[PDB]
Design a protein around this ligand. Sequence first.
Ligand code: PT5
Ligand code: PT5
Ligand code: PT5
Ligand code: NAG
Ligand code: K
Ligand code: K
Ligand code: K
Ligand code: K
Lengths: 321, 321, 607, 274
Amino acid sequence: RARFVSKKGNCNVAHKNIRERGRFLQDVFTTLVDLKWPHTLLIFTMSFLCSWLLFAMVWWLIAFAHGDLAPGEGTNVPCVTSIHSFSSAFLFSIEVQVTIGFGGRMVTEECPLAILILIVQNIVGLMINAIMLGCIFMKTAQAHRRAETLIFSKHAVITLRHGRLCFMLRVGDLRKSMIISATIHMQVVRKTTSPEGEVVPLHQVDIPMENGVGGNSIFLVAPLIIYHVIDSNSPLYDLAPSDLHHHQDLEIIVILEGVVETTGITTQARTSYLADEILWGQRFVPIVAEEDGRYSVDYSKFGNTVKVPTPLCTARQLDED
Amino acid sequence: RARFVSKKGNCNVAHKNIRERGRFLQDVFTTLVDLKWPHTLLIFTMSFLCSWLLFAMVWWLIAFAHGDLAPGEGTNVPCVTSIHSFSSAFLFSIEVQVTIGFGGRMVTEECPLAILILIVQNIVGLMINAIMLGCIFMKTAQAHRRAETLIFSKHAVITLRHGRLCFMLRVGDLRKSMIISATIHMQVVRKTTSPEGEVVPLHQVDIPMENGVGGNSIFLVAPLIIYHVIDSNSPLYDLAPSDLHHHQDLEIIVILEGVVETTGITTQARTSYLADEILWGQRFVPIVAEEDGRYSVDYSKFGNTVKVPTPLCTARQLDED
Amino acid sequence: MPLAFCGTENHSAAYRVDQGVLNNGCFVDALNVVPHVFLLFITFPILFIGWGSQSSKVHIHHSTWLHFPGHNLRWILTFILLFVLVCEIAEGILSDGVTESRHLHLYMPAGMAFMAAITSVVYYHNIETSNFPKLLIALLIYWTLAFITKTIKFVKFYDHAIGFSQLRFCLTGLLVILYGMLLLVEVNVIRVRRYIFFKTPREVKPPEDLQDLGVRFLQPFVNLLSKGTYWWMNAFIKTAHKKPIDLRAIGKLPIAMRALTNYQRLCVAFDAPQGARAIWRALCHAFGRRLILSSTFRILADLLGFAGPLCIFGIVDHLGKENHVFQPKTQFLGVYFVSSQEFLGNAYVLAVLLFLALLLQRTFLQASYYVAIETGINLRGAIQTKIYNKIMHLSTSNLSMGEMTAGQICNLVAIDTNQLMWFFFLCPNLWAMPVQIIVGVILLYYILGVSALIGAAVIILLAPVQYFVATKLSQAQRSTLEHSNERLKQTNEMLRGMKLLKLYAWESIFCSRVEVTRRKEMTSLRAFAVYTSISIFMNTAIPIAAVLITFVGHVSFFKESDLSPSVAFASLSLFHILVTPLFLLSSVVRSTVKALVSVKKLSEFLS
Amino acid sequence: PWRACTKYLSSAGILLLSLLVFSQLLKHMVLVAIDYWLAKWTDSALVDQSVYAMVFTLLCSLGIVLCLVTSVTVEWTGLKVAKRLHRSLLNRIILAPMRFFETTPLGSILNRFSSDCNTIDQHIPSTLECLSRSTLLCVSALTVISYVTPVFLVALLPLAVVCYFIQKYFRVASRDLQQLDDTTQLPLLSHFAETVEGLTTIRAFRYEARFQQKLLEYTDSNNIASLFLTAANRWLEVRMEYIGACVVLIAAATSISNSLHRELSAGLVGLGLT
Ligand SMILES: CCCCC/C=C/C/C=C\C/C=C/C/C=C/CCCC(=O)O[C@H](COC(=O)CCCCCCCCCCCCCCCCC)COP(=O)(O)O[C@@H]1[C@H](O)[C@H](O)[C@@H](OP(=O)(O)O)[C@H](OP(=O)(O)O)[C@H]1O
Ligand SMILES: CCCCC/C=C/C/C=C\C/C=C/C/C=C/CCCC(=O)O[C@H](COC(=O)CCCCCCCCCCCCCCCCC)COP(=O)(O)O[C@@H]1[C@H](O)[C@H](O)[C@@H](OP(=O)(O)O)[C@H](OP(=O)(O)O)[C@H]1O
Ligand SMILES: CCCCC/C=C/C/C=C\C/C=C/C/C=C\CCCC(=O)O[C@H](COC(=O)CCCCCCCCCCCCCCCCC)COP(=O)(O)O[C@@H]1[C@H](O)[C@H](O)[C@@H](OP(=O)(O)O)[C@H](OP(=O)(O)O)[C@H]1O
Ligand SMILES: *[C@@H]1O[C@H](CO)[C@@H](O)[C@H](O)[C@H]1NC(C)=O
Ligand SMILES: [K+]
Ligand SMILES: [K+]
Ligand SMILES: [K+]
Ligand SMILES: [K+]
């Protein structure tokens, strides 16, 4: 088989035969930030290093054209003082663009073209400085890494709650900080064929969770049990305990989206429960206690379940009794 | 005819006879970032270049008033060392404001006014540096360019699904990264006349899409089919296959809004299907397949449709049988 | 003496730019680096962003592409451009080694031009695959800058009385031409495929084929280089090892050569009787404009074949002469210029030039093979359609018997149209053999004089011998087949019935005359075998005789100076590349008469 | 593949097979020496058997005679092993069980008795002889370069490794292409065989368009197999030529360096380049 979403939230889909490369070229910045860190470091390094080299040749060339490279006598004021070779020009380019300015190699007022290049390099230097420094901070401050500290259960549980079967799972937050405006979306991913004969390979049917005022809103500070009540209009209304084997083509996806309180950027944590990762005769064990004047959450027992008496019939059969 | 929204999401509306120019003047920053790139480069260049020139004249003037420009003898400590002409003053202004500081031209402690200008230039230099560099990064990191990699179908489909006619279309995401909190809004744009005689040239009627938990929420990692079920209260409840010709005045708009996972800025992808761009007796072909242990999406067959047996009657006539 | 772009002579007086900057040789050479760094700084950000950024989960494969107008010309010019720059780098290094200091301006600008020229090809190909005609402006700017900066250097040579005697003057002149023509090519695509200036972006007109028709034989669609290296097949073979191939992975045939489009032109040419003479006129008209292309590649490959021995002759003479004295004897502006004669004097230069000469030769002969084969099987499909059409409708009032002869028709399309196809496989080979032979013997005569004439004559006289034994070998198999058929017929009387023949126990005496029926065929095998063994030592051992009749003849009847290693190996190399193209000469003559019978057989059976 | 080829030496015996190995190896070794002495003689020509160097010619005169006898030594033995294979199969055929013959199709035996033996007789000894001289000459050509310059062999081995991979990927693909070309050959001529008989049952009854177009399906399947087989060969040769051309440049550059690095060599270098 294959997993639509990995247990860690990675999506196992490969996009193939794209014939619209122009769209990717028209969207450059998103490409720049989406690069892996070894490529981001290379681009960050090569953006400044090539910029210094490009103007280093310009500084070297105009010093050549002005006769500054020739050591013949003196009495001539160079475009840039103390420039002898390309290495001097390259060092001067670094001083100007990074705004170090040692002053041993200084621009003089003899060559208006040199003053023109000094204006151009500073303007170009600022734009490269602005984009690249901002780009690498966006790369660092991405909110998807915050999703690594949002943990779901390794197993999902279907059991009787208030007389109806409920597909339950537990989601917790390890960090002290909060997830502002957290929303939970649960979907069923399987191949469904309509009566007209249309087949959808990964038809994602959105299932609701019981919240009391609708859904898609939680206050995640202690590990919550997120459960969906299986009723007449639920896609799992005809799910039997015999169906919960490895090769079933039945996947449940849980999505947790919210604004990271520490950073301010919305994140997304995903997980998936295959058919064999759902336990029928089980129930989660409480892990919240009260020590002194502060509730203590025991994350060691996060995913533990305890068998409970549950009917081996489908939710359809339960209504029919 | 005319299109309310282009196939690429461009809105073809021109605002005319605006007599409130004071509102645009009162909102300058949004104007600054909304400029096209050639104007943004000009403003970015002219903001620093004019700043250097403005203080260059000030540095040149106070060196004149202090007698520094006069080469008569020595024994006098200038306001700024090694300033001879305006070019020297202009070079000194660049060194101070860009914080290069070569040191051949250095501020001395003889003219308190010169020290005052040095304080003023640095404070003004920082504000211009802060606003302009931040402005050009916002211009670069705009989220609208991310919408260029959110492809829609070139044709919509109105076929039979679960016994009811459904206006279907396919939306996909080319990038590996996700669109967090993606929402889909579909609207019908046409001229509707109320019984009282009021006419609305572009009355945008909002139509729902079947999601199962309400709507306006998708998990777009694989190309989804977004469809609206045509029922009694739907605006297309009296739509016939004979009405799907070019000159019909019937437009469907699809809006996809979500936070860009890579960047963190909400984006918006738009598209429109005119009457002749909607195919009646068709159906999208599945493109999602399973290769090894990873689903493969074949974007070459993205918009392809296959004819299917569909009644040639309106949804009103279907209920009447 | 550190690294210096302009070299450290006098007091670095070569860096002085008085009397004009453009009159300073180094500055103009430095000015020529500007276009090359421009191309690198433009294409690399573009290539990385659109092509090298997304990977491993985003596939942007284009299984459809249209070549820009002038695609073939652009690749030809770049290959010439790449070759000339290699000569310019080699020319610069020779001039630089004489001085005590290293003048980087002699070769470094040309060396960096080599990277930019390659990058332009890489940049163009990626753009061309994914359309993007607007991005061709970067090349358009690059060619204009390169043409401007190379014109300046060429003009200044003319001012400084630098004639064609100096090689660097010639190489710079060619680069102006090559940059000029490449500039025109970029202008040409703007005219044909208007995309920037005109307000009508002319329709791309996508190819009729190359769609999702299952075409896997991408040879007529890939770029020019991939046509000469078959790089498209590399990916196909890379997966053929993992999975066995089938008639489905092999795909469908391209539209231009399926079967019908070959026959469609065949019958069109037939419009002009239908005799043997009339058949050849149609085939020449239908499949001649492509056949000459294969011969032309073969001719050029044959011409470059002599570049092997010539480089061998050149390298040894300038290596065995010792001396090791190198002096350009031509110094302008304090810079040494090497003459054309002196440039082709260094062993390293000859070795590099030989390496480039082989690559063009090896590719050309391979290109000659495929075009002939592709055209050969194109005729085979058309001929089979004509043969089948002859048997089928439009053949009213069949003469008599069982359609003339059932057996004759079966072999007519089995082992008679193949001979016609194999004639076109070797049609350039017969044409290109005399050209290689006449130049080969002439070059031998200019190396070893009289002794080479005798050695070449006996090899030429071997060609009738090879054909003579070919007729004997062919006749031996003909006599063998008469006896083998009787042996097969006698054996195939109860062999298929051996499931029931063995039951009667009558096979004990049946398998007693098998040796007799085989010995009557083995004695014919002996006649066939001895003829084969005769051809072996008449082919394998004949180069040894050719060497001896040329070597020992230098004093037996020539009486000349002692032979040098250069002249000995050059003639040995010429003999080696001449003996091998002789077996095909005997084979093609045998194939020529065999095909002539087959076409006559087809012509007489046509009506 | 070729693992079962360790057998079949019984037909060639021991004395006969060893004679071919000794003779074939001798011819290549002498030719190496013949060219080697030519280089030394030419080197000695420009300045002790320097007198008219007829000894080297005499060594060259025996080689062709030794090559002459080798041509028939490997050819005469090939005939006898065909006789022994013919004799061995005949004894098995007579003693072949009838029940096994009934169970088997009994047609493959007839094809193996006639078609396979015919290939073994007139083709295999020639192909094996050509293979032996080619696979030995390259090794000899890979030793003269070592003699002229022991420095070239440092990078020669990695190039041969790349040659091994290219060859390994070609034989697999080419043989499968050969099968498909053989596979598609049968329907094309069989359809023509079906065309010559019952043509009047096709012309009168049918429009004949389907049958003619059915052939185009056969010809296209045949043509694609042919050019794909051709393209694989052209793919193989080109990568082989580029490896060979690269070898020349490495050999030439190394040989030139030794002469200019006071390593003598002189005219001996020109021998290796040829
Ligand atoms: C006597 C001598 C003594 C010598 C002693 C030696 C002395 C050695 C001297 C100095 C250097 C040691 C410096 C110490 C520096 C720390 C830098 C701090 C900034 C920094 O953060 O850099 C770090 C460290 O790497 C570097 O250092 C990269 C730093 C940038 C390198 C720029 C070099 C410029 C190259 C130019 C050279 C060529 C110039 C040519 C010159 C000629 C031109 C004419 C980058 O490391 P990282 O942790 O951010 O990246 C990982 C990694 O890339 C993983 O692939 C990535 O996985 P994914 O993103 O999920 O795919 C991980 O992501 P997760 O967070 O999810 O796990 C990242 O966490
Ligand atoms: C011997 C000598 C040798 C000489 C050799 C030559 C040597 C030449 C020397 C040095 C320069 C070459 C520098 C190489 C630089 C790259 C800069 C990198 C920063 C950068 O990103 O700049 C780039 C390149 O343009 C520039 O270069 C613009 C750079 C800013 C220019 C500032 C110049 C300052 C003017 C002051 C002069 C006047 C001063 C007066 C002085 C006297 C005062 C007293 C801007 O290009 P862009 O790609 O961002 O802009 C496009 C374009 O604008 C399209 O219109 C836009 O369409 P929309 O936005 O949709 O409307 C595209 O948007 P999309 O993304 O959707 O497609 C943009 O992508
Ligand atoms: C003295 C020597 C001077 C050497 C330096 C030269 C300094 C001089 C500086 C700059 C000028 C030389 C400029 C090159 C000139 C002309 C290019 C004009 C072509 C052009 O417009 O560029 C864009 C690509 O966007 C980029 O990627 C553009 C990306 C930026 C391009 C410039 C790269 C900037 C970084 C380079 C500097 C690197 C510095 C360090 C890096 C800094 C990083 C911040 C065209 O490409 P496209 O793919 O968008 O257009 C296609 C194509 O045209 C289709 O036919 C068309 O139809 P459909 O595909 O069916 O829809 C579509 O057209 P649209 O674009 O309207 O949708 C697009 O699909
Ligand atoms: C400079 O070098 C040149 C050699 O090209 C020669 O005229 C002399 O050695 C030097 N002349 C002067 C004036 O320095
Ligand atoms: K300083
Ligand atoms: K600073
Ligand atoms: K500073
Ligand atoms: K200082």
